[PDB]
Design a protein around this ligand. Sequence first.
Ligand SMILES: O=S(=O)(O)CCN1CCN(CCO[C@@H]2O[C@H](CO)[C@@H](O)[C@H](O)[C@H]2O)CC1
Ligand SMILES: [Cl-]
Ligand code: NA
Length: 472
Amino acid sequence: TVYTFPDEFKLGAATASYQIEGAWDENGKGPNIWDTLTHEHPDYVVDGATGDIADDSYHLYKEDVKILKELGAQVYRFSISWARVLPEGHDNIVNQDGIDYYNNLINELLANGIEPMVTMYHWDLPQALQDLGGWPNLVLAKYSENYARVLFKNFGDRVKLWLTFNDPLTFMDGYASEIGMAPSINTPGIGDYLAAHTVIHAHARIYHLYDQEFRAEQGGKVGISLNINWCEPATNSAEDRASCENYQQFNLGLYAHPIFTEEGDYPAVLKDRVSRNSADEGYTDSRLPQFTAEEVEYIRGTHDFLGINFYTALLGKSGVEGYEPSRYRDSGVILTQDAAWPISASSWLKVVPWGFRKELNWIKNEYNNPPVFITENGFSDYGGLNDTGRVHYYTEHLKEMLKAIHEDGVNVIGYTAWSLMDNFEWLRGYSEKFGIYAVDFEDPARPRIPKESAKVLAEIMNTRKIPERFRD
Ligand SMILES: O=S(=O)(O)CCN1CCN(CCO[C@@H]2O[C@H](CO)[C@@H](O)[C@H](O)[C@H]2O)CC1
Ligand SMILES: [Cl-]
Ligand code: NA
Protein backbone atom coordinates (compact mmCIF):
# COMPACT_ATOMS: atom_id res chain seq x y z
CA THR A 1 0.00 0.00 0.00
CA VAL A 2 2.69 2.52 1.03
CA TYR A 3 4.36 1.94 -2.35
CA THR A 4 1.26 2.50 -4.52
CA PHE A 5 0.05 5.81 -5.91
CA PRO A 6 -3.56 6.78 -5.20
CA ASP A 7 -5.75 6.15 -8.26
CA GLU A 8 -6.46 9.82 -8.97
CA PHE A 9 -2.88 11.03 -8.29
CA LYS A 10 -1.33 12.77 -11.34
CA LEU A 11 2.24 12.00 -12.43
CA GLY A 12 4.24 13.88 -15.05
CA ALA A 13 7.14 16.20 -15.81
CA ALA A 14 7.84 19.94 -15.93
CA THR A 15 9.72 22.66 -17.81
CA ALA A 16 9.90 26.47 -18.00
CA SER A 17 9.76 28.71 -21.07
CA TYR A 18 13.12 30.50 -21.01
CA GLN A 19 14.86 27.27 -20.03
CA ILE A 20 13.61 25.36 -23.10
CA GLU A 21 12.02 27.43 -25.85
CA GLY A 22 14.69 29.40 -27.65
CA ALA A 23 13.34 31.52 -30.50
CA TRP A 24 14.01 34.48 -28.20
CA ASP A 25 13.23 37.15 -30.84
CA GLU A 26 11.29 35.10 -33.38
CA ASN A 27 7.92 36.03 -34.87
CA GLY A 28 7.23 39.10 -32.77
CA LYS A 29 8.40 37.94 -29.33
CA GLY A 30 9.56 40.86 -27.19
CA PRO A 31 12.64 40.90 -24.97
CA ASN A 32 12.54 39.71 -21.39
CA ILE A 33 14.89 40.19 -18.44
CA TRP A 34 16.72 36.91 -19.18
CA ASP A 35 17.38 37.99 -22.77
CA THR A 36 18.80 41.15 -21.21
CA LEU A 37 20.90 39.36 -18.60
CA THR A 38 22.40 36.78 -20.92
CA HIS A 39 23.08 39.30 -23.69
CA GLU A 40 24.41 42.17 -21.59
CA HIS A 41 26.00 40.26 -18.71
CA PRO A 42 27.48 36.97 -19.98
CA ASP A 43 29.98 37.30 -17.13
CA TYR A 44 27.11 36.38 -14.78
CA VAL A 45 26.49 33.02 -16.47
CA VAL A 46 28.63 29.88 -16.66
CA ASP A 47 30.20 29.67 -20.13
CA GLY A 48 28.47 32.95 -21.09
CA ALA A 49 25.54 30.74 -22.07
CA THR A 50 22.22 32.11 -23.29
CA GLY A 51 18.70 30.82 -23.78
CA ASP A 52 18.67 32.05 -27.39
CA ILE A 53 18.13 28.47 -28.62
CA ALA A 54 18.12 26.27 -25.48
CA ASP A 55 16.15 23.09 -26.33
CA ASP A 56 14.49 24.85 -29.28
CA SER A 57 11.09 23.82 -27.92
CA TYR A 58 9.48 26.72 -29.78
CA HIS A 59 10.17 24.70 -32.94
CA LEU A 60 10.38 21.21 -31.41
CA TYR A 61 7.29 21.14 -29.20
CA LYS A 62 5.99 18.04 -30.98
CA GLU A 63 9.20 16.23 -29.96
CA ASP A 64 8.54 17.25 -26.35
CA VAL A 65 5.07 15.76 -26.58
CA LYS A 66 6.54 12.58 -28.13
CA ILE A 67 8.87 12.07 -25.16
CA LEU A 68 6.09 12.87 -22.69
CA LYS A 69 3.99 10.18 -24.37
CA GLU A 70 6.91 7.71 -24.19
CA LEU A 71 7.33 8.55 -20.51
CA GLY A 72 3.62 8.02 -19.90
CA ALA A 73 3.13 11.44 -18.33
CA GLN A 74 -0.45 12.21 -17.31
CA VAL A 75 0.33 15.90 -16.96
CA TYR A 76 2.89 18.27 -18.46
CA ARG A 77 3.69 21.42 -16.50
CA PHE A 78 5.13 24.16 -18.72
CA SER A 79 5.27 27.94 -18.50
CA ILE A 80 4.13 30.66 -20.86
CA SER A 81 6.54 33.36 -21.94
CA TRP A 82 4.87 36.67 -21.11
CA ALA A 83 6.83 38.57 -23.78
CA ARG A 84 6.00 35.96 -26.43
CA VAL A 85 2.28 36.68 -25.86
CA LEU A 86 2.41 40.40 -24.94
CA PRO A 87 5.67 41.66 -26.46
CA GLU A 88 5.31 45.07 -24.81
CA GLY A 89 4.26 43.59 -21.47
CA HIS A 90 1.09 45.66 -21.43
CA ASP A 91 -1.97 44.14 -23.06
CA ASN A 92 -2.24 46.56 -25.97
CA ILE A 93 -0.59 44.15 -28.40
CA VAL A 94 -1.26 40.43 -28.43
CA ASN A 95 1.21 38.45 -30.52
CA GLN A 96 -0.85 35.96 -32.55
CA ASP A 97 2.27 33.88 -33.16
CA GLY A 98 2.57 33.31 -29.42
CA ILE A 99 -1.12 32.50 -29.08
CA ASP A 100 -0.78 29.99 -31.93
CA TYR A 101 2.35 28.42 -30.41
CA TYR A 102 0.78 27.69 -27.03
CA ASN A 103 -2.45 26.54 -28.64
CA ASN A 104 -0.40 24.19 -30.81
CA LEU A 105 1.36 22.76 -27.76
CA ILE A 106 -1.88 22.44 -25.77
CA ASN A 107 -3.68 20.76 -28.64
CA GLU A 108 -0.77 18.38 -29.28
CA LEU A 109 -0.75 17.41 -25.59
CA LEU A 110 -4.47 16.77 -25.49
CA ALA A 111 -4.37 14.76 -28.75
CA ASN A 112 -1.82 12.53 -27.02
CA GLY A 113 -3.81 12.16 -23.78
CA ILE A 114 -1.60 14.49 -21.69
CA GLU A 115 -3.13 17.19 -19.50
CA PRO A 116 -1.56 20.69 -19.69
CA MET A 117 -0.66 22.47 -16.46
CA VAL A 118 0.34 26.07 -17.10
CA THR A 119 2.60 28.31 -15.09
CA MET A 120 1.91 31.93 -16.02
CA TYR A 121 5.18 33.33 -14.70
CA HIS A 122 8.46 31.41 -14.41
CA TRP A 123 10.91 34.30 -14.12
CA ASP A 124 10.84 35.83 -17.61
CA LEU A 125 9.43 39.35 -17.07
CA PRO A 126 9.13 41.52 -20.21
CA GLN A 127 11.94 44.09 -20.24
CA ALA A 128 9.40 46.88 -20.85
CA LEU A 129 7.94 46.15 -17.39
CA GLN A 130 11.34 45.83 -15.74
CA ASP A 131 12.02 49.32 -17.08
CA LEU A 132 9.27 50.63 -14.76
CA GLY A 133 11.15 48.97 -11.89
CA GLY A 134 9.81 45.46 -12.28
CA TRP A 135 8.40 43.54 -9.36
CA PRO A 136 9.13 46.20 -6.67
CA ASN A 137 6.69 48.47 -8.51
CA LEU A 138 3.12 47.60 -7.46
CA VAL A 139 1.74 48.71 -10.83
CA LEU A 140 2.81 45.25 -12.05
CA ALA A 141 -0.07 43.63 -10.13
CA LYS A 142 -2.64 45.09 -12.54
CA TYR A 143 -0.37 44.29 -15.50
CA SER A 144 -0.23 40.69 -14.25
CA GLU A 145 -4.03 40.56 -14.05
CA ASN A 146 -4.26 41.74 -17.65
CA TYR A 147 -1.73 39.14 -18.80
CA ALA A 148 -3.66 36.40 -16.99
CA ARG A 149 -6.89 37.52 -18.67
CA VAL A 150 -5.30 36.98 -22.08
CA LEU A 151 -4.19 33.51 -20.97
CA PHE A 152 -7.56 32.49 -19.53
CA LYS A 153 -9.45 33.82 -22.57
CA ASN A 154 -7.25 32.06 -25.12
CA PHE A 155 -6.33 28.83 -23.36
CA GLY A 156 -8.69 28.26 -20.44
CA ASP A 157 -11.22 26.27 -22.47
CA ARG A 158 -8.55 23.52 -22.57
CA VAL A 159 -6.31 24.29 -19.57
CA LYS A 160 -7.78 23.38 -16.17
CA LEU A 161 -4.65 23.61 -13.99
CA TRP A 162 -2.90 26.95 -13.52
CA LEU A 163 -0.06 28.28 -11.42
CA THR A 164 0.12 32.08 -11.22
CA PHE A 165 3.78 32.23 -10.18
CA ASN A 166 6.73 29.91 -9.90
CA ASP A 167 8.88 30.41 -6.82
CA PRO A 168 8.85 34.12 -6.00
CA LEU A 169 11.13 33.30 -3.04
CA THR A 170 13.83 32.84 -5.68
CA PHE A 171 12.84 35.45 -8.23
CA MET A 172 12.47 38.18 -5.60
CA ASP A 173 16.22 37.61 -5.08
CA GLY A 174 16.79 39.17 -8.50
CA TYR A 175 16.32 42.42 -6.55
CA ALA A 176 18.88 41.45 -3.89
CA SER A 177 22.15 41.04 -5.84
CA GLU A 178 24.01 43.01 -8.55
CA ILE A 179 25.34 39.76 -10.12
CA GLY A 180 22.51 37.27 -9.58
CA MET A 181 19.12 36.28 -10.94
CA ALA A 182 17.61 38.69 -13.45
CA PRO A 183 17.22 41.63 -13.26
CA SER A 184 20.35 41.57 -11.08
CA ILE A 185 19.59 44.61 -8.94
CA ASN A 186 21.25 45.15 -5.60
CA THR A 187 18.45 46.17 -3.19
CA PRO A 188 18.65 43.39 -0.57
CA GLY A 189 16.30 43.70 2.38
CA ILE A 190 14.29 46.41 0.60
CA GLY A 191 13.53 45.73 -3.06
CA ASP A 192 13.13 41.98 -2.68
CA TYR A 193 10.43 42.56 -0.04
CA LEU A 194 8.71 45.05 -2.37
CA ALA A 195 8.84 42.45 -5.13
CA ALA A 196 7.24 39.84 -2.86
CA HIS A 197 4.49 42.30 -1.95
CA THR A 198 3.65 42.97 -5.59
CA VAL A 199 3.68 39.27 -6.44
CA ILE A 200 1.24 38.47 -3.62
CA HIS A 201 -1.05 41.26 -4.81
CA ALA A 202 -0.75 40.06 -8.42
CA HIS A 203 -1.51 36.47 -7.47
CA ALA A 204 -4.63 37.58 -5.62
CA ARG A 205 -5.83 39.71 -8.54
CA ILE A 206 -5.37 36.76 -10.90
CA TYR A 207 -7.32 34.40 -8.63
CA HIS A 208 -10.19 36.86 -8.25
CA LEU A 209 -10.13 37.44 -12.02
CA TYR A 210 -10.57 33.70 -12.55
CA ASP A 211 -13.48 33.67 -10.10
CA GLN A 212 -15.19 36.65 -11.73
CA GLU A 213 -14.55 36.17 -15.44
CA PHE A 214 -13.75 32.48 -16.10
CA ARG A 215 -14.37 29.85 -13.43
CA ALA A 216 -18.07 29.23 -14.06
CA GLU A 217 -17.39 28.48 -17.73
CA GLN A 218 -13.97 26.83 -17.49
CA GLY A 219 -14.13 24.86 -14.24
CA GLY A 220 -10.38 24.76 -13.59
CA LYS A 221 -8.12 25.30 -10.60
CA VAL A 222 -5.65 28.07 -9.80
CA GLY A 223 -2.69 27.72 -7.44
CA ILE A 224 0.82 29.11 -6.90
CA SER A 225 4.13 27.20 -6.75
CA LEU A 226 6.36 27.86 -3.77
CA ASN A 227 9.88 26.53 -3.23
CA ILE A 228 10.90 25.56 0.28
CA ASN A 229 13.84 23.66 1.73
CA TRP A 230 13.42 21.56 4.82
CA CYS A 231 15.35 23.14 7.72
CA GLU A 232 16.51 20.56 10.25
CA PRO A 233 17.54 21.73 13.72
CA ALA A 234 21.32 21.43 14.05
CA THR A 235 20.73 20.14 17.59
CA ASN A 236 17.54 19.18 19.46
CA SER A 237 17.48 22.40 21.47
CA ALA A 238 14.41 24.61 21.68
CA GLU A 239 16.56 27.48 20.39
CA ASP A 240 17.57 25.57 17.27
CA ARG A 241 13.97 24.52 16.74
CA ALA A 242 12.96 28.21 16.96
CA SER A 243 15.49 29.04 14.25
CA CYS A 244 14.02 26.41 11.93
CA GLU A 245 10.51 27.76 12.47
CA ASN A 246 11.92 31.20 11.59
CA TYR A 247 13.28 29.65 8.40
CA GLN A 248 9.94 28.16 7.41
CA GLN A 249 8.14 31.45 8.03
CA PHE A 250 10.75 33.59 6.23
CA ASN A 251 10.87 31.35 3.15
CA LEU A 252 7.53 29.56 2.76
CA GLY A 253 5.38 31.63 5.15
CA LEU A 254 6.32 34.90 3.45
CA TYR A 255 4.05 33.82 0.58
CA ALA A 256 1.88 31.08 2.09
CA HIS A 257 0.73 32.86 5.26
CA PRO A 258 -1.01 35.65 3.31
CA ILE A 259 -2.73 33.20 0.97
CA PHE A 260 -3.24 29.83 2.70
CA THR A 261 -4.18 30.70 6.29
CA GLU A 262 -7.53 31.85 7.66
CA GLU A 263 -5.84 34.89 9.20
CA GLY A 264 -3.89 36.01 6.16
CA ASP A 265 -1.19 38.69 6.30
CA TYR A 266 2.53 38.00 6.60
CA PRO A 267 3.65 35.75 9.48
CA ALA A 268 3.96 37.64 12.77
CA VAL A 269 7.63 36.69 13.14
CA LEU A 270 8.37 38.18 9.72
CA LYS A 271 6.62 41.47 10.50
CA ASP A 272 8.08 41.68 13.99
CA ARG A 273 11.72 40.82 13.20
CA VAL A 274 11.87 43.21 10.25
CA SER A 275 10.14 45.96 12.28
CA ARG A 276 12.66 45.62 15.07
CA ASN A 277 15.68 45.44 12.77
CA SER A 278 14.51 48.43 10.76
CA ALA A 279 14.03 50.50 13.91
CA ASP A 280 17.44 49.51 15.27
CA GLU A 281 19.09 50.62 12.03
CA GLY A 282 17.43 54.01 12.12
CA TYR A 283 14.74 53.70 9.44
CA THR A 284 11.60 55.73 10.10
CA ASP A 285 9.59 53.00 8.36
CA SER A 286 9.88 49.23 8.48
CA ARG A 287 11.54 47.75 5.42
CA LEU A 288 8.66 45.25 5.23
CA PRO A 289 5.67 46.59 3.26
CA GLN A 290 2.25 46.40 4.91
CA PHE A 291 -1.14 45.07 3.87
CA THR A 292 -4.25 46.96 4.92
CA ALA A 293 -7.03 44.96 6.57
CA GLU A 294 -8.99 45.08 3.33
CA GLU A 295 -5.98 43.75 1.40
CA VAL A 296 -5.48 40.97 3.95
CA GLU A 297 -9.06 39.86 3.38
CA TYR A 298 -8.73 40.11 -0.41
CA ILE A 299 -5.56 38.02 -0.50
CA ARG A 300 -6.41 35.27 1.97
CA GLY A 301 -8.17 32.28 0.43
CA THR A 302 -6.95 32.88 -3.12
CA HIS A 303 -6.13 29.25 -3.84
CA ASP A 304 -7.49 25.98 -5.14
CA PHE A 305 -4.28 24.07 -4.30
CA LEU A 306 -0.69 24.68 -3.22
CA GLY A 307 2.17 23.93 -5.61
CA ILE A 308 5.40 22.89 -3.94
CA ASN A 309 8.88 22.84 -5.43
CA PHE A 310 11.09 20.66 -3.25
CA TYR A 311 14.78 19.92 -3.78
CA THR A 312 16.83 19.82 -0.58
CA ALA A 313 17.36 20.55 3.08
CA LEU A 314 19.52 22.74 5.30
CA LEU A 315 20.58 22.62 8.93
CA GLY A 316 19.46 25.56 11.06
CA LYS A 317 20.79 26.83 14.34
CA SER A 318 20.00 29.74 16.60
CA GLY A 319 21.67 33.01 15.63
CA VAL A 320 21.82 35.76 13.05
CA GLU A 321 24.12 36.14 10.10
CA GLY A 322 24.21 37.79 6.71
CA TYR A 323 24.49 41.37 5.56
CA GLU A 324 22.46 44.28 6.93
CA PRO A 325 19.88 44.63 5.45
CA SER A 326 18.86 41.29 3.97
CA ARG A 327 16.12 38.70 4.18
CA TYR A 328 18.59 36.10 5.42
CA ARG A 329 19.82 38.35 8.22
CA ASP A 330 16.25 39.28 9.13
CA SER A 331 15.27 35.60 9.30
CA GLY A 332 17.30 34.82 12.44
CA VAL A 333 18.77 31.44 11.54
CA ILE A 334 22.30 30.28 10.76
CA LEU A 335 22.15 27.85 7.83
CA THR A 336 24.58 25.08 6.91
CA GLN A 337 24.54 21.71 5.19
CA ASP A 338 25.74 18.39 6.57
CA ALA A 339 28.90 17.11 4.87
CA ALA A 340 27.52 13.57 5.12
CA TRP A 341 24.59 14.24 2.78
CA PRO A 342 25.07 13.00 -0.80
CA ILE A 343 26.02 15.72 -3.25
CA SER A 344 24.84 16.72 -6.70
CA ALA A 345 26.32 18.89 -9.48
CA SER A 346 24.81 21.94 -7.74
CA SER A 347 26.44 23.43 -4.66
CA TRP A 348 23.08 24.22 -3.06
CA LEU A 349 21.49 20.81 -3.67
CA LYS A 350 22.18 17.91 -1.31
CA VAL A 351 20.16 14.70 -1.25
CA VAL A 352 17.99 14.65 1.89
CA PRO A 353 14.88 12.66 1.01
CA TRP A 354 13.46 12.45 4.54
CA GLY A 355 13.39 16.26 4.50
CA PHE A 356 10.65 16.04 1.89
CA ARG A 357 8.40 14.09 4.26
CA LYS A 358 9.17 16.52 7.09
CA GLU A 359 8.34 19.50 4.89
CA LEU A 360 5.07 17.97 3.73
CA ASN A 361 4.05 17.45 7.37
CA TRP A 362 5.03 21.03 8.27
CA ILE A 363 2.78 22.27 5.44
CA LYS A 364 -0.06 19.97 6.48
CA ASN A 365 0.03 21.28 10.02
CA GLU A 366 0.53 24.97 9.21
CA TYR A 367 -2.04 25.31 6.41
CA ASN A 368 -4.68 22.72 7.43
CA ASN A 369 -3.74 20.07 4.89
CA PRO A 370 -4.29 21.92 1.62
CA PRO A 371 -4.22 19.89 -1.60
CA VAL A 372 -0.53 19.91 -2.55
CA PHE A 373 0.76 19.38 -6.08
CA ILE A 374 4.52 18.77 -6.25
CA THR A 375 5.33 20.99 -9.20
CA GLU A 376 9.13 20.42 -9.11
CA ASN A 377 11.50 17.85 -7.65
CA GLY A 378 14.80 16.77 -9.25
CA PHE A 379 18.53 16.37 -9.23
CA SER A 380 21.63 17.57 -11.07
CA ASP A 381 24.63 15.87 -12.54
CA TYR A 382 27.17 17.02 -15.15
CA GLY A 383 26.04 14.60 -17.87
CA GLY A 384 25.55 10.94 -18.65
CA LEU A 385 22.72 8.57 -19.45
CA ASN A 386 23.40 6.05 -16.70
CA ASP A 387 22.19 8.53 -14.13
CA THR A 388 22.19 6.36 -11.00
CA GLY A 389 22.22 9.38 -8.68
CA ARG A 390 19.11 10.78 -10.33
CA VAL A 391 17.35 7.40 -10.23
CA HIS A 392 18.10 7.14 -6.49
CA TYR A 393 16.99 10.72 -5.95
CA TYR A 394 13.61 10.09 -7.58
CA THR A 395 12.90 6.71 -6.03
CA GLU A 396 13.77 7.95 -2.53
CA HIS A 397 11.80 11.20 -2.84
CA LEU A 398 8.78 9.38 -4.24
CA LYS A 399 8.95 6.84 -1.40
CA GLU A 400 9.06 9.66 1.15
CA MET A 401 6.13 11.42 -0.52
CA LEU A 402 4.15 8.16 -0.50
CA LYS A 403 4.81 7.81 3.25
CA ALA A 404 3.56 11.37 3.69
CA ILE A 405 0.38 10.43 1.83
CA HIS A 406 -0.32 7.00 3.27
CA GLU A 407 1.21 7.13 6.74
CA ASP A 408 0.82 10.83 7.54
CA GLY A 409 -2.41 11.73 5.73
CA VAL A 410 -0.92 14.57 3.67
CA ASN A 411 -3.20 15.47 0.73
CA VAL A 412 -0.66 15.32 -2.07
CA ILE A 413 -2.53 15.24 -5.40
CA GLY A 414 0.18 15.21 -8.08
CA TYR A 415 3.86 15.28 -8.93
CA THR A 416 5.78 16.61 -11.94
CA ALA A 417 9.47 15.73 -12.11
CA TRP A 418 11.90 18.59 -12.74
CA SER A 419 12.84 18.47 -15.62
CA LEU A 420 11.58 16.70 -18.72
CA MET A 421 14.90 17.51 -20.38
CA ASP A 422 18.28 19.11 -19.75
CA ASN A 423 17.83 22.81 -20.29
CA PHE A 424 19.24 26.29 -19.71
CA GLU A 425 19.92 26.21 -15.96
CA TRP A 426 19.81 29.96 -15.33
CA LEU A 427 23.18 31.33 -14.12
CA ARG A 428 24.67 27.84 -14.46
CA GLY A 429 24.10 27.81 -18.22
CA TYR A 430 24.18 24.32 -19.71
CA SER A 431 26.74 23.08 -17.17
CA GLU A 432 24.26 21.48 -14.77
CA LYS A 433 21.91 18.81 -16.03
CA PHE A 434 18.46 18.32 -14.44
CA GLY A 435 16.73 16.39 -17.19
CA ILE A 436 15.37 12.91 -17.31
CA TYR A 437 16.00 13.22 -21.09
CA ALA A 438 19.44 14.28 -22.28
CA VAL A 439 19.78 16.97 -24.94
CA ASP A 440 22.81 17.50 -27.16
CA PHE A 441 23.32 21.27 -27.13
CA GLU A 442 25.99 20.95 -29.84
CA ASP A 443 23.52 19.37 -32.28
CA PRO A 444 21.28 21.93 -34.03
CA ALA A 445 18.47 19.33 -34.05
CA ARG A 446 18.58 19.14 -30.21
CA PRO A 447 17.70 15.43 -29.99
CA ARG A 448 16.14 14.30 -26.71
CA ILE A 449 17.26 10.87 -25.51
CA PRO A 450 16.08 8.99 -22.44
CA LYS A 451 18.35 8.57 -19.43
CA GLU A 452 17.96 5.65 -17.04
CA SER A 453 15.86 7.95 -14.85
CA ALA A 454 13.37 8.44 -17.70
CA LYS A 455 13.09 4.64 -18.00
CA VAL A 456 12.59 4.18 -14.26
CA LEU A 457 10.04 7.01 -14.09
CA ALA A 458 8.20 5.46 -17.06
CA GLU A 459 8.09 2.17 -15.13
CA ILE A 460 6.73 3.98 -12.06
CA MET A 461 4.13 5.82 -14.14
CA ASN A 462 3.05 2.64 -15.93
CA THR A 463 2.85 0.38 -12.87
CA ARG A 464 1.65 3.14 -10.51
CA LYS A 465 3.98 1.90 -7.82
CA ILE A 466 7.58 1.93 -6.64
CA PRO A 467 9.26 -1.18 -8.12
CA GLU A 468 10.32 -3.82 -5.64
CA ARG A 469 14.05 -3.36 -6.29
CA PHE A 470 13.87 0.23 -4.97
CA ARG A 471 11.94 -0.58 -1.80
CA ASP A 472 13.60 -0.53 1.63
O1 LIG B 1 22.51 31.49 -7.25
S1 LIG B 1 22.61 30.69 -6.00
O2 LIG B 1 22.38 31.53 -4.81
O3 LIG B 1 23.96 30.09 -5.90
C1 LIG B 1 21.51 29.42 -5.97
C2 LIG B 1 20.10 29.83 -6.37
N1 LIG B 1 19.11 28.81 -5.98
C3 LIG B 1 17.75 29.35 -6.21
C4 LIG B 1 16.65 28.33 -5.90
N2 LIG B 1 16.79 27.18 -6.79
C5 LIG B 1 15.86 26.05 -6.54
C6 LIG B 1 14.42 26.33 -6.93
O4 LIG B 1 14.37 26.78 -8.28
C7 LIG B 1 14.24 25.78 -9.26
O5 LIG B 1 15.57 25.29 -9.47
C8 LIG B 1 15.73 24.46 -10.61
C9 LIG B 1 17.13 23.87 -10.52
O6 LIG B 1 18.00 24.92 -10.09
C10 LIG B 1 15.49 25.36 -11.82
O7 LIG B 1 15.79 24.71 -13.05
C11 LIG B 1 14.01 25.75 -11.81
O8 LIG B 1 13.69 26.67 -12.86
C12 LIG B 1 13.68 26.46 -10.50
O9 LIG B 1 12.27 26.60 -10.34
C13 LIG B 1 18.13 26.62 -6.54
C14 LIG B 1 19.25 27.61 -6.81
CL1 LIG C 1 13.22 -6.89 -9.40
NA1 NA D 1 -6.62 38.13 -26.71
